[PDB]
């Protein structure tokens, strides 16, 4: 386990309410960046941390089937996470980006009501 940065915590505070928004804020801007950005590999790793950390900590939250945000996010984050590893550092297609934007919109919207 040689891997381990000095910093701790991708950004989540453990609160499902803000945590959902935190990963969304990072993901929206992450995919927004230009495919010509040098932080293409770095930004992917950062977001990947939020993705894994988000479901990992909230894995036992409900395992989906109760919260629209968690259920929707589970698939959205998993789908997008696969894109980076599936192709690597390649940029996410514009089609997926547009669809993902809505996915996150629905997730943050659910937080307001607190499904």
From Swiss-Prot:
Membrane protein topology class: Lipid-anchor
Family assignment from sequence similarity: Belongs to the Psb27 family.
Disulfide bonds listed in the record: none
Species: Synechocystis sp. (strain ATCC 27184 / PCC 6803 / Kazusa)
Annotated function: Plays a role in the repair and/or biogenesis of the calcium-manganese-oxide cluster on the lumenal face of the thylakoid membrane. Photosystem II (PSII) complexes containing this protein are monomeric, are assembly intermediates lacking the calcium-manganese-oxide cluster and miss some of the lumenal subunits. Probably blocks binding of some of the small lumenal subunits.
Lipidation (N-palmitoyl cysteine): 6
One cellular-component annotation, GO: plasma membrane-derived thylakoid photosystem II
S-diacylglycerol cysteine-type lipidated residues: 6
Location(s), subcellular: Cellular thylakoid membrane
Subunit structure as annotated in this protein's UniProt entry: Monomer. Forms a complex with a monomeric, partially assembled PSII. This is probably the complex in which D1 is assembled and/or replaced. Present in 6-10% of PSII complexes; mostly in monomeric PSII. These PSII do not evolve oxygen, do not have an assembled calcium-manganese-oxide cluster.
Name this protein carries in UniProt: Photosystem II lipoprotein Psb27
Keywords of the record: Lipoprotein, Membrane, Palmitate, Photosynthesis, Photosystem II, Signal, Thylakoid
Broad class of the protein's primary localization: membrane
Coverage span on the entire protein: 25 to 134 of 134
Gene Ontology BP term (one): photosystem II repair
Protein origin, superkingdom: Bacteria
Summary of the knockout phenotype: Not essential for photoautotrophic growth, under CaCl(2) limiting-conditions absolutely required. Impaired recovery after photoinhibition due to impaired assembly of the calcium-manganese-oxide cluster, especially at high light intensities. CP43 (psbC) is more susceptible to degradation, higher turnover of D1 (psbA). Calcium-manganese-oxide cluster assembly is improved in a double psbO-psb27 mutant. A double psbM-psb27 mutant is incapable of photoautotrophic growth, but does assemble the CP43-less assembly intermediate.
Taxonomic lineage: Bacteria, Bacillati, Cyanobacteriota, Cyanophyceae, Synechococcales
């Amino acid at each position: 386990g040689p891997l381990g940065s000095c910093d701790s915590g991708t950004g989540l505070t453990g609160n499902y309410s803000q945590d959902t928004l935190t990963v969304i804020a990072t993901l929206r801007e992450a995919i927004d960046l230009p495919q010509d950005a040098p932080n293409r590999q770095e930004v992917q790793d950062t977001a990947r941390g939020q993705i894994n950390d988000y479901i990992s900590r909230y894995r036992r939250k409900g395992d989906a089937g109760g919260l629209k945000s968690f259920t929707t996010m589970q698939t959205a984050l998993n789908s997008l996470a696969g894109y980076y590893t599936s192709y690597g550092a390649r940029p996410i297609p514009e089609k997926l980006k547009k669809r993902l934007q809505l996915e996150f919109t629905q997730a943050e919207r659910s937080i307001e009501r607190g499904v």
